[PDB]
Amino acid sequence: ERLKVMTIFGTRPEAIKMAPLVLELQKHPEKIESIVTVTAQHRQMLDQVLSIFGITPDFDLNIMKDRQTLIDITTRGLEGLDKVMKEAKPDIVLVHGDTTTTFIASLAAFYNQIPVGHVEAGLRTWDKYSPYPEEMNRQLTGVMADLHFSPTAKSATNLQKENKDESRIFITGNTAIDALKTTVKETYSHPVLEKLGNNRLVLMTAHRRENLGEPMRNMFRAIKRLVDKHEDVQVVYPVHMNPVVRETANDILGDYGRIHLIEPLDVIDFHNVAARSYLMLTDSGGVQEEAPSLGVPVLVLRDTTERPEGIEAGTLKLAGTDEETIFSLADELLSDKEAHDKMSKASNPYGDGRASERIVEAILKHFNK
Amino acid sequence: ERLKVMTIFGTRPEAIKMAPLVLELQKHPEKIESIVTVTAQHRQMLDQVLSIFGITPDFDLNIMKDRQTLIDITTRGLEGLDKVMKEAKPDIVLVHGDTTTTFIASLAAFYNQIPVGHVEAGLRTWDKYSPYPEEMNRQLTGVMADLHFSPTAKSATNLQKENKDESRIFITGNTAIDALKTTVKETYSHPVLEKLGNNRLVLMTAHRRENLGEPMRNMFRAIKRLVDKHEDVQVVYPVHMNPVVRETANDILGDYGRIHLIEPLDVIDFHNVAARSYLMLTDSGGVQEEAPSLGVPVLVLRDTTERPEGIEAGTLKLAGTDEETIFSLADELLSDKEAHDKMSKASNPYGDGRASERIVEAILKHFNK
Ligand SMILES: CNS(=O)(=O)c1cnn(-c2ccccc2)c1C
Ligand SMILES: CNS(=O)(=O)c1cnn(-c2ccccc2)c1C
């Protein structure tokens, strides 16, 4: 008699994070009945991802979060998920991250005396109101969880500090990394990629509120100096621009066709483009965790990092927001094939692409299957 | 402009445990606006206890429990508690113990950024299905609470180990002890006491489910021998009759006129009868923590205890479930005034009647009032 594992997809960014885990569950059809519940409001991108991974949802709930109060989401989500669990009778419910839906998915499981496995567990701020409600959500979910799937030792330590049972805490790595063997296809085309030759690609992303104004100008001025010094380098900046910010770009960069400002990429095209990049400049937390597993050095357009383990492993370097520092560090890595290759080969500490395997193994052990 | 302090009374037993806190809040009318919110379905006795304490609720919600599901109580409760907290806008909400109402009151407060003071905090079995849902409710309430008022070091230590802010963890004692200053009258009449006259009362309490079978039969054989060896003793067992008991009773206890099986007592009657008791035989945690403040030696009808502090202080002794140890220990206390008086004058480690004082002092300091 098969172990019934229900996986919740509660938000769009969970598609990439939970689809690899479902794919791994679907590799044990003899021991495991994989049941997929989607509750996310926005479906186009998620549905795109589930299809790439050959996943068909067993339950679709519409839980609205457009101008909706926590109270309404909490009560209507609790009802909705409780019904799904009374019907499908899972042996375990797997929930991701710090969302209100993960909290109520766990509470509904508890209210049916069904075990919960918490994917991406142990992130702590220790500030109940920052973020709000996310910190409290991950604590609430933490007390209800039977199994904790921590992406890093620090997250596992946080959970140990709360006197959680060590035998129920697993350092798995980050499941998003696991997606890459599915999403990244050797036979992949993009306009931006055609324009690039055997030319070295610098992929740059900045979307942080704090990088508006001078920091963007410093970035653009640094990029100008880089493409002038390195003639075999093209730069890709997928962002959407205000006209006046466009004029600023054009004024600094000119129109010499080796810097491509393009519209923001979907996750799939991003993965595939990042995978063919020589260097990355980012202010994104997630790129810091993911892009190194593609063998891409990551320079972080910030003064401080919330990813200390990437720094330590040498997968990441801080570039700050000063023109000089951004130019200095990018130039080092584009000049010295040795120092690029080094960061390119450093092991990603946020995982090795087997987080889903470790989660499934931990579940089978726990249930004596 | 006064600190607005909302105390929640979600159930009839909480009445006794929270009324003294309210009395204490009402002694600071310059600094504190005491708001009392009652959410229980059954109010008769709650109102009785409220009346004795001189407390008038400000808010009355009817959260129906009888034949209601966890989900229904959870959604309706959360809606009604949110509404009342937007209506009153208190600076802090006080909640007791491990009820579902405490949990949802804490969530409603969190969803309005209102601080939670958790009365009777830190009790742990670490088994999420025993008791269900009480263990998880107090764990859930615990992550959401700003101030924790633990009856004992043991419960305070459980919170410390969960990495709670030591500055928010207070060992206050048990507020139920506080209640006795008010509920126990110098003079009191009740059938039990009329029929007692100048006889020594042994007062027995036993849950019927956990003492079902050989235990109760053993307690019956033992109390029978007690009255056989002591002509001046009456045994009173408040129990909800069922021809099971009747047959068990009449079979062992007989009709010699000094063992009375009576209908369960309301808390005020109980306190006032226990306050006139020579000895208590009990399996009640509350009786273990409260009765000793009345100077009553307490024998615990259990082979195992989760209240070791009372054992060590000398206010409690483990009597077991077997006839011979129950008899032997009660017989002793009835046959040796010294042994009785020793247990009777032993200091109650669960509190000194000033728990409410300590709770209010903590609130005031926390708000720098
Ligand atoms: C939406 N703009 S974009 O084209 O720069 C893009 C697409 N996916 N990502 C991304 C990939 C992994 C982790 C976090 C984020 C970015 C930064
Ligand atoms: C319901 N049966 S009864 O009459 O023996 C009774 C009344 N109040 N109590 C009681 C008193 C304090 C703490 C806990 C429980 C009992 C055990």
mmCIF file of all heavy atoms in Angstrom, chain A residues 70-71 74 78 82 110-111 113 126 128-129 132 136 140 143-144 146 161-163, chain B residues 71 74-75 78 82 110-111 113 128-129 132 136 139-140 143-144 146 161-163:
data_model
loop_
_atom_site.group_PDB
_atom_site.id
_atom_site.type_symbol
_atom_site.label_atom_id
_atom_site.label_comp_id
_atom_site.label_asym_id
_atom_site.label_seq_id
_atom_site.Cartn_x
_atom_site.Cartn_y
_atom_site.Cartn_z
ATOM 1 N N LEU A 70 -5.612 39.207 5.648
ATOM 2 C CA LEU A 70 -5.032 37.975 6.159
ATOM 3 C C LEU A 70 -6.139 37.055 6.671
ATOM 4 O O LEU A 70 -6.057 35.847 6.523
ATOM 5 C CB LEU A 70 -3.992 38.294 7.242
ATOM 6 C CG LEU A 70 -2.659 38.804 6.716
ATOM 7 C CD1 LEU A 70 -1.684 39.175 7.821
ATOM 8 C CD2 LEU A 70 -2.040 37.739 5.855
ATOM 9 N N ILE A 71 -7.147 37.624 7.337
ATOM 10 C CA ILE A 71 -8.204 36.884 8.012
ATOM 11 C C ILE A 71 -8.966 36.044 7.001
ATOM 12 O O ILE A 71 -9.209 34.887 7.249
ATOM 13 C CB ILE A 71 -9.169 37.827 8.768
ATOM 14 C CG1 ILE A 71 -8.520 38.332 10.052
ATOM 15 C CG2 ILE A 71 -10.503 37.145 9.094
ATOM 16 C CD1 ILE A 71 -8.593 37.315 11.145
ATOM 17 N N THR A 74 -6.859 33.315 5.482
ATOM 18 C CA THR A 74 -6.602 32.319 6.506
ATOM 19 C C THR A 74 -7.814 31.374 6.654
ATOM 20 O O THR A 74 -7.678 30.150 6.607
ATOM 21 C CB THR A 74 -6.148 32.987 7.807
ATOM 22 O OG1 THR A 74 -4.933 33.724 7.583
ATOM 23 C CG2 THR A 74 -5.909 32.020 8.934
ATOM 24 N N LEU A 78 -7.933 27.738 4.970
ATOM 25 C CA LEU A 78 -8.058 26.626 5.907
ATOM 26 C C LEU A 78 -9.218 25.674 5.522
ATOM 27 O O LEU A 78 -9.017 24.477 5.331
ATOM 28 C CB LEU A 78 -8.274 27.209 7.288
ATOM 29 C CG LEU A 78 -8.341 26.209 8.426
ATOM 30 C CD1 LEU A 78 -7.096 25.368 8.473
ATOM 31 C CD2 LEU A 78 -8.557 26.917 9.758
ATOM 32 N N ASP A 82 -8.656 21.970 4.049
ATOM 33 C CA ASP A 82 -9.122 20.921 4.937
ATOM 34 C C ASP A 82 -9.949 19.955 4.091
ATOM 35 O O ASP A 82 -9.733 18.757 4.175
ATOM 36 C CB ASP A 82 -9.952 21.474 6.093
ATOM 37 C CG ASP A 82 -10.460 20.409 7.044
ATOM 38 O OD1 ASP A 82 -9.621 19.873 7.843
ATOM 39 O OD2 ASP A 82 -11.675 20.147 7.011
ATOM 40 N N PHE A 110 -2.667 19.401 10.428
ATOM 41 C CA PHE A 110 -2.709 19.157 11.855
ATOM 42 C C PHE A 110 -4.135 18.843 12.315
ATOM 43 O O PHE A 110 -4.351 18.003 13.205
ATOM 44 C CB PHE A 110 -2.163 20.385 12.592
ATOM 45 C CG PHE A 110 -2.164 20.213 14.067
ATOM 46 C CD1 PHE A 110 -1.454 19.184 14.631
ATOM 47 C CD2 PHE A 110 -3.027 20.962 14.841
ATOM 48 C CE1 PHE A 110 -1.573 18.931 15.980
ATOM 49 C CE2 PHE A 110 -3.105 20.740 16.195
ATOM 50 C CZ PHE A 110 -2.378 19.725 16.752
ATOM 51 N N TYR A 111 -5.094 19.565 11.733
ATOM 52 C CA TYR A 111 -6.521 19.444 12.060
ATOM 53 C C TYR A 111 -7.119 18.132 11.526
ATOM 54 O O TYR A 111 -8.274 17.836 11.791
ATOM 55 C CB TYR A 111 -7.239 20.692 11.511
ATOM 56 C CG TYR A 111 -7.226 21.887 12.432
ATOM 57 C CD1 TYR A 111 -6.450 21.904 13.575
ATOM 58 C CD2 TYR A 111 -8.037 22.976 12.188
ATOM 59 C CE1 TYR A 111 -6.471 22.961 14.459
ATOM 60 C CE2 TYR A 111 -8.068 24.041 13.066
ATOM 61 C CZ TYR A 111 -7.302 24.038 14.203
ATOM 62 O OH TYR A 111 -7.325 25.151 15.033
ATOM 63 N N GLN A 113 -4.716 15.533 11.582
ATOM 64 C CA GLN A 113 -3.711 14.660 12.182
ATOM 65 C C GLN A 113 -2.916 14.021 11.035
ATOM 66 O O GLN A 113 -2.640 12.838 11.063
ATOM 67 C CB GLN A 113 -4.348 13.590 13.087
ATOM 68 C CG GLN A 113 -5.113 14.130 14.292
ATOM 69 C CD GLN A 113 -5.172 13.095 15.411
ATOM 70 O OE1 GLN A 113 -4.943 11.898 15.219
ATOM 71 N NE2 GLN A 113 -5.491 13.536 16.616
ATOM 72 N N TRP A 126 14.280 36.535 13.701
ATOM 73 C CA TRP A 126 14.013 36.575 15.129
ATOM 74 C C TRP A 126 13.232 37.844 15.479
ATOM 75 O O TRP A 126 13.215 38.237 16.636
ATOM 76 C CB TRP A 126 15.311 36.414 15.951
ATOM 77 C CG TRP A 126 16.127 35.187 15.636
ATOM 78 C CD1 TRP A 126 17.315 35.144 14.940
ATOM 79 C CD2 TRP A 126 15.796 33.823 15.972
ATOM 80 N NE1 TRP A 126 17.746 33.847 14.832
ATOM 81 C CE2 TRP A 126 16.850 33.020 15.474
ATOM 82 C CE3 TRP A 126 14.725 33.202 16.669
ATOM 83 C CZ2 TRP A 126 16.848 31.618 15.607
ATOM 84 C CZ3 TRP A 126 14.752 31.826 16.862
ATOM 85 C CH2 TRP A 126 15.809 31.043 16.319
ATOM 86 N N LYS A 128 9.473 39.260 14.955
ATOM 87 C CA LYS A 128 8.145 38.762 14.601
ATOM 88 C C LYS A 128 7.401 39.659 13.592
ATOM 89 O O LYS A 128 6.363 39.255 13.044
ATOM 90 C CB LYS A 128 7.325 38.563 15.880
ATOM 91 C CG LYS A 128 7.149 39.796 16.764
ATOM 92 C CD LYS A 128 6.197 39.519 17.978
ATOM 93 C CE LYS A 128 4.776 39.108 17.585
ATOM 94 N NZ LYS A 128 3.836 39.116 18.724
ATOM 95 N N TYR A 129 7.896 40.893 13.384
ATOM 96 C CA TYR A 129 7.227 41.869 12.539
ATOM 97 C C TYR A 129 8.084 42.257 11.329
ATOM 98 O O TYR A 129 7.728 43.154 10.592
ATOM 99 C CB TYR A 129 6.776 43.092 13.343
ATOM 100 C CG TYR A 129 5.690 42.896 14.375
ATOM 101 C CD1 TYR A 129 5.897 43.231 15.724
ATOM 102 C CD2 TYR A 129 4.481 42.330 14.034
ATOM 103 C CE1 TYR A 129 4.913 43.016 16.690
ATOM 104 C CE2 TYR A 129 3.493 42.088 14.990
ATOM 105 C CZ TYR A 129 3.697 42.450 16.313
ATOM 106 O OH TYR A 129 2.676 42.268 17.221
ATOM 107 N N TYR A 132 6.821 40.670 7.930
ATOM 108 C CA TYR A 132 5.465 40.523 8.427
ATOM 109 C C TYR A 132 4.532 40.225 7.261
ATOM 110 O O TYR A 132 4.384 41.073 6.394
ATOM 111 C CB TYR A 132 4.982 41.844 9.017
ATOM 112 C CG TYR A 132 3.586 41.816 9.577
ATOM 113 C CD1 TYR A 132 3.314 41.096 10.722
ATOM 114 C CD2 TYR A 132 2.560 42.585 9.033
ATOM 115 C CE1 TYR A 132 2.047 41.043 11.252
ATOM 116 C CE2 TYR A 132 1.267 42.503 9.530
ATOM 117 C CZ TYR A 132 1.011 41.743 10.666
ATOM 118 O OH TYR A 132 -0.227 41.685 11.287
ATOM 119 N N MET A 136 6.673 35.111 11.251
ATOM 120 C CA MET A 136 5.751 34.401 12.123
ATOM 121 C C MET A 136 5.210 33.150 11.438
ATOM 122 O O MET A 136 5.053 32.127 12.093
ATOM 123 C CB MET A 136 4.605 35.331 12.524
ATOM 124 C CG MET A 136 3.753 34.726 13.640
ATOM 125 S SD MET A 136 4.713 34.245 15.086
ATOM 126 C CE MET A 136 5.518 35.738 15.576
ATOM 127 N N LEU A 140 5.282 29.451 13.063
ATOM 128 C CA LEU A 140 4.036 28.723 13.189
ATOM 129 C C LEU A 140 4.112 27.382 12.462
ATOM 130 O O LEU A 140 3.832 26.347 13.045
ATOM 131 C CB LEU A 140 2.887 29.584 12.662
ATOM 132 C CG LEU A 140 2.513 30.797 13.529
ATOM 133 C CD1 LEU A 140 1.553 31.685 12.759
ATOM 134 C CD2 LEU A 140 1.889 30.405 14.880
ATOM 135 N N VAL A 143 6.496 24.885 14.308
ATOM 136 C CA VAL A 143 6.041 24.084 15.447
ATOM 137 C C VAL A 143 5.183 22.909 14.974
ATOM 138 O O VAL A 143 5.110 21.914 15.685
ATOM 139 C CB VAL A 143 5.360 24.884 16.570
ATOM 140 C CG1 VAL A 143 6.349 25.835 17.216
ATOM 141 C CG2 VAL A 143 4.154 25.645 16.110
ATOM 142 N N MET A 144 4.542 23.023 13.812
ATOM 143 C CA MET A 144 3.585 22.008 13.322
ATOM 144 C C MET A 144 4.287 20.929 12.496
ATOM 145 O O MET A 144 3.750 19.827 12.389
ATOM 146 C CB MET A 144 2.471 22.643 12.468
ATOM 147 C CG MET A 144 1.443 23.362 13.366
ATOM 148 S SD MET A 144 0.019 24.047 12.515
ATOM 149 C CE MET A 144 0.783 25.416 11.655
ATOM 150 N N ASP A 146 6.597 17.990 10.942
ATOM 151 C CA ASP A 146 7.138 16.715 11.387
ATOM 152 C C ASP A 146 8.569 16.540 10.853
ATOM 153 O O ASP A 146 9.408 15.988 11.541
ATOM 154 C CB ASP A 146 6.213 15.554 10.969
ATOM 155 C CG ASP A 146 4.893 15.607 11.732
ATOM 156 O OD1 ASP A 146 3.950 16.366 11.303
ATOM 157 O OD2 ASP A 146 4.840 15.028 12.767
ATOM 158 N N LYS A 161 18.366 25.464 17.677
ATOM 159 C CA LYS A 161 18.327 26.487 18.719
ATOM 160 C C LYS A 161 16.912 26.621 19.302
ATOM 161 O O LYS A 161 16.751 27.116 20.420
ATOM 162 C CB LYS A 161 18.834 27.834 18.166
ATOM 163 C CG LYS A 161 20.277 28.207 18.502
ATOM 164 C CD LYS A 161 20.952 29.255 17.559
ATOM 165 C CE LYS A 161 20.125 30.479 17.195
ATOM 166 N NZ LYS A 161 20.060 31.504 18.268
ATOM 167 N N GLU A 162 15.876 26.264 18.544
ATOM 168 C CA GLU A 162 14.484 26.302 19.011
ATOM 169 C C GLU A 162 14.086 24.961 19.637
ATOM 170 O O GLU A 162 12.919 24.736 19.957
ATOM 171 C CB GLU A 162 13.518 26.619 17.858
ATOM 172 C CG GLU A 162 13.802 27.984 17.274
ATOM 173 C CD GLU A 162 12.926 28.340 16.094
ATOM 174 O OE1 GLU A 162 12.292 27.435 15.535
ATOM 175 O OE2 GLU A 162 12.872 29.534 15.781
ATOM 176 N N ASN A 163 15.078 24.078 19.794
ATOM 177 C CA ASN A 163 14.929 22.827 20.521
ATOM 178 C C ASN A 163 14.080 21.848 19.719
ATOM 179 O O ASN A 163 13.491 20.939 20.302
ATOM 180 C CB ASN A 163 14.366 23.058 21.912
ATOM 181 C CG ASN A 163 14.636 21.893 22.832
ATOM 182 O OD1 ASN A 163 13.820 21.647 23.704
ATOM 183 N ND2 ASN A 163 15.680 21.128 22.577
ATOM 184 N N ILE B 71 -12.280 23.163 12.818
ATOM 185 C CA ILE B 71 -12.268 24.130 11.720
ATOM 186 C C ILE B 71 -13.304 25.212 12.042
ATOM 187 O O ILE B 71 -12.971 26.404 11.942
ATOM 188 C CB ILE B 71 -12.589 23.502 10.344
ATOM 189 C CG1 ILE B 71 -11.500 22.552 9.878
ATOM 190 C CG2 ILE B 71 -12.806 24.581 9.287
ATOM 191 C CD1 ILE B 71 -10.305 23.267 9.291
ATOM 192 N N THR B 74 -12.362 27.474 14.838
ATOM 193 C CA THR B 74 -11.165 28.191 14.415
ATOM 194 C C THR B 74 -11.489 29.379 13.502
ATOM 195 O O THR B 74 -10.991 30.469 13.742
ATOM 196 C CB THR B 74 -10.189 27.218 13.732
ATOM 197 O OG1 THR B 74 -9.715 26.231 14.671
ATOM 198 C CG2 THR B 74 -9.009 27.933 13.153
ATOM 199 N N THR B 75 -12.322 29.183 12.466
ATOM 200 C CA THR B 75 -12.713 30.256 11.557
ATOM 201 C C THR B 75 -13.654 31.247 12.251
ATOM 202 O O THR B 75 -13.392 32.445 12.233
ATOM 203 C CB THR B 75 -13.294 29.724 10.248
ATOM 204 O OG1 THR B 75 -14.475 28.959 10.510
ATOM 205 C CG2 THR B 75 -12.248 28.907 9.525
ATOM 206 N N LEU B 78 -11.755 33.267 14.953
ATOM 207 C CA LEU B 78 -10.765 34.195 14.425
ATOM 208 C C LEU B 78 -11.433 35.452 13.867
ATOM 209 O O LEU B 78 -10.962 36.594 14.068
ATOM 210 C CB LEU B 78 -9.957 33.456 13.347
ATOM 211 C CG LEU B 78 -8.817 34.253 12.754
ATOM 212 C CD1 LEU B 78 -7.741 34.493 13.813
ATOM 213 C CD2 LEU B 78 -8.309 33.575 11.511
ATOM 214 N N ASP B 82 -10.951 38.960 15.776
ATOM 215 C CA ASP B 82 -10.431 40.068 14.978
ATOM 216 C C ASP B 82 -11.384 41.270 15.087
ATOM 217 O O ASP B 82 -10.971 42.408 15.299
ATOM 218 C CB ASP B 82 -10.222 39.691 13.501
ATOM 219 C CG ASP B 82 -9.643 40.793 12.614
ATOM 220 O OD1 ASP B 82 -8.457 41.127 12.767
ATOM 221 O OD2 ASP B 82 -10.366 41.291 11.749
ATOM 222 N N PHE B 110 -1.947 39.058 16.490
ATOM 223 C CA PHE B 110 -0.821 39.122 15.550
ATOM 224 C C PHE B 110 -1.216 39.780 14.211
ATOM 225 O O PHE B 110 -0.481 40.624 13.667
ATOM 226 C CB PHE B 110 -0.177 37.759 15.364
ATOM 227 C CG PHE B 110 0.892 37.785 14.296
ATOM 228 C CD1 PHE B 110 2.086 38.450 14.495
ATOM 229 C CD2 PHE B 110 0.690 37.170 13.065
ATOM 230 C CE1 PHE B 110 3.014 38.537 13.461
ATOM 231 C CE2 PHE B 110 1.659 37.198 12.062
ATOM 232 C CZ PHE B 110 2.810 37.917 12.245
ATOM 233 N N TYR B 111 -2.392 39.429 13.698
ATOM 234 C CA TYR B 111 -2.922 40.024 12.476
ATOM 235 C C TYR B 111 -3.311 41.501 12.637
ATOM 236 O O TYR B 111 -3.661 42.155 11.642
ATOM 237 C CB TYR B 111 -4.107 39.198 11.941
ATOM 238 C CG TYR B 111 -3.731 37.911 11.232
ATOM 239 C CD1 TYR B 111 -4.716 37.056 10.760
ATOM 240 C CD2 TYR B 111 -2.412 37.507 11.041
ATOM 241 C CE1 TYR B 111 -4.404 35.852 10.150
ATOM 242 C CE2 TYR B 111 -2.082 36.306 10.401
ATOM 243 C CZ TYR B 111 -3.092 35.500 9.920
ATOM 244 O OH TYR B 111 -2.837 34.367 9.215
ATOM 245 N N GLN B 113 -1.129 43.393 14.813
ATOM 246 C CA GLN B 113 0.060 43.902 15.482
ATOM 247 C C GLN B 113 -0.232 44.280 16.936
ATOM 248 O O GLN B 113 0.286 45.269 17.435
ATOM 249 C CB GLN B 113 0.636 45.013 14.620
ATOM 250 C CG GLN B 113 0.968 44.524 13.211
ATOM 251 C CD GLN B 113 1.620 45.603 12.378
ATOM 252 O OE1 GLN B 113 2.731 45.999 12.693
ATOM 253 N NE2 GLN B 113 0.988 46.027 11.290
ATOM 254 N N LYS B 128 2.348 16.043 19.725
ATOM 255 C CA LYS B 128 1.444 16.994 19.112
ATOM 256 C C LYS B 128 0.038 16.401 19.062
ATOM 257 O O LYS B 128 -0.927 17.145 18.845
ATOM 258 C CB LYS B 128 2.027 17.482 17.771
ATOM 259 C CG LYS B 128 2.380 16.397 16.768
ATOM 260 C CD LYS B 128 3.059 16.924 15.511
ATOM 261 C CE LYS B 128 2.068 17.442 14.493
ATOM 262 N NZ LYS B 128 2.589 17.459 13.101
ATOM 263 N N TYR B 129 -0.082 15.080 19.328
ATOM 264 C CA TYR B 129 -1.383 14.400 19.356
ATOM 265 C C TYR B 129 -1.737 13.914 20.758
ATOM 266 O O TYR B 129 -2.802 13.287 20.905
ATOM 267 C CB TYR B 129 -1.468 13.233 18.350
ATOM 268 C CG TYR B 129 -1.141 13.602 16.916
ATOM 269 C CD1 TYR B 129 -0.364 12.765 16.128
ATOM 270 C CD2 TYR B 129 -1.574 14.792 16.338
ATOM 271 C CE1 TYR B 129 -0.041 13.089 14.820
ATOM 272 C CE2 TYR B 129 -1.244 15.121 15.029
ATOM 273 C CZ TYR B 129 -0.471 14.268 14.268
ATOM 274 O OH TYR B 129 -0.110 14.571 12.987
ATOM 275 N N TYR B 132 -4.333 16.518 22.260
ATOM 276 C CA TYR B 132 -4.770 17.091 20.993
ATOM 277 C C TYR B 132 -6.085 17.843 21.150
ATOM 278 O O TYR B 132 -7.086 17.261 21.557
ATOM 279 C CB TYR B 132 -5.005 15.990 19.977
ATOM 280 C CG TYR B 132 -5.396 16.456 18.596
ATOM 281 C CD1 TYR B 132 -4.444 16.850 17.669
ATOM 282 C CD2 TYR B 132 -6.735 16.484 18.214
ATOM 283 C CE1 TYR B 132 -4.805 17.239 16.389
ATOM 284 C CE2 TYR B 132 -7.094 16.845 16.931
ATOM 285 C CZ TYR B 132 -6.130 17.230 16.013
ATOM 286 O OH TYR B 132 -6.506 17.585 14.733
ATOM 287 N N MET B 136 -0.195 21.511 20.695
ATOM 288 C CA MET B 136 0.120 22.387 19.564
ATOM 289 C C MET B 136 -0.404 23.816 19.799
ATOM 290 O O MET B 136 0.299 24.777 19.502
ATOM 291 C CB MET B 136 -0.462 21.832 18.265
ATOM 292 C CG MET B 136 0.079 22.472 17.016
ATOM 293 S SD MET B 136 1.875 22.267 16.923
ATOM 294 C CE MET B 136 2.064 20.532 16.790
ATOM 295 N N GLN B 139 2.081 25.584 21.884
ATOM 296 C CA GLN B 139 3.253 25.825 21.049
ATOM 297 C C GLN B 139 3.012 26.964 20.053
ATOM 298 O O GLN B 139 3.846 27.865 19.960
ATOM 299 C CB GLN B 139 3.688 24.540 20.352
ATOM 300 C CG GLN B 139 4.430 23.605 21.289
ATOM 301 C CD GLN B 139 5.260 22.584 20.553
ATOM 302 O OE1 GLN B 139 6.056 22.949 19.701
ATOM 303 N NE2 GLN B 139 5.179 21.321 20.980
ATOM 304 N N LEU B 140 1.846 26.967 19.375
ATOM 305 C CA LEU B 140 1.426 28.031 18.463
ATOM 306 C C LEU B 140 1.275 29.371 19.174
ATOM 307 O O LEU B 140 1.835 30.397 18.760
ATOM 308 C CB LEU B 140 0.112 27.648 17.781
ATOM 309 C CG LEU B 140 0.196 26.468 16.821
ATOM 310 C CD1 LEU B 140 -1.159 25.948 16.508
ATOM 311 C CD2 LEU B 140 0.907 26.857 15.549
ATOM 312 N N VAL B 143 4.846 30.914 19.995
ATOM 313 C CA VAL B 143 5.653 31.638 18.993
ATOM 314 C C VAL B 143 5.130 33.064 18.802
ATOM 315 O O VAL B 143 5.929 33.950 18.509
ATOM 316 C CB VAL B 143 5.844 30.910 17.632
ATOM 317 C CG1 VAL B 143 6.754 29.682 17.801
ATOM 318 C CG2 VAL B 143 4.563 30.484 16.983
ATOM 319 N N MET B 144 3.818 33.262 19.056
ATOM 320 C CA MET B 144 3.116 34.533 18.869
ATOM 321 C C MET B 144 3.159 35.422 20.104
ATOM 322 O O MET B 144 3.012 36.624 19.982
ATOM 323 C CB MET B 144 1.658 34.306 18.477
ATOM 324 C CG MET B 144 1.548 33.783 17.003
ATOM 325 S SD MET B 144 -0.144 33.569 16.409
ATOM 326 C CE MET B 144 -0.586 32.018 17.212
ATOM 327 N N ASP B 146 4.381 37.782 23.239
ATOM 328 C CA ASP B 146 5.374 38.816 23.506
ATOM 329 C C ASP B 146 5.863 38.675 24.948
ATOM 330 O O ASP B 146 7.048 38.910 25.201
ATOM 331 C CB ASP B 146 4.790 40.219 23.281
ATOM 332 C CG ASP B 146 4.376 40.427 21.830
ATOM 333 O OD1 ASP B 146 3.256 39.997 21.468
ATOM 334 O OD2 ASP B 146 5.187 40.919 21.047
ATOM 335 N N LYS B 161 14.606 27.176 26.265
ATOM 336 C CA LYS B 161 15.249 26.222 25.370
ATOM 337 C C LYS B 161 14.726 26.339 23.932
ATOM 338 O O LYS B 161 15.403 25.882 22.997
ATOM 339 C CB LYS B 161 15.115 24.800 25.920
ATOM 340 C CG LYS B 161 16.020 24.553 27.114
ATOM 341 C CD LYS B 161 15.570 23.385 28.000
ATOM 342 C CE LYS B 161 16.722 22.735 28.749
ATOM 343 N NZ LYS B 161 16.764 21.263 28.524
ATOM 344 N N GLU B 162 13.536 26.958 23.780
ATOM 345 C CA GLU B 162 12.919 27.232 22.499
ATOM 346 C C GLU B 162 13.420 28.574 21.956
ATOM 347 O O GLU B 162 12.971 29.021 20.888
ATOM 348 C CB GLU B 162 11.404 27.211 22.652
ATOM 349 C CG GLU B 162 10.838 25.823 22.806
ATOM 350 C CD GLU B 162 9.338 25.831 23.063
ATOM 351 O OE1 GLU B 162 8.802 26.919 23.251
ATOM 352 O OE2 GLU B 162 8.722 24.733 23.116
ATOM 353 N N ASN B 163 14.401 29.177 22.647
ATOM 354 C CA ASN B 163 15.095 30.377 22.189
ATOM 355 C C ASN B 163 14.186 31.606 22.253
ATOM 356 O O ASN B 163 14.358 32.558 21.456
ATOM 357 C CB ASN B 163 15.657 30.208 20.771
ATOM 358 C CG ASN B 163 16.702 31.248 20.437
ATOM 359 O OD1 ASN B 163 16.622 31.898 19.390
ATOM 360 N ND2 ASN B 163 17.647 31.436 21.346
#
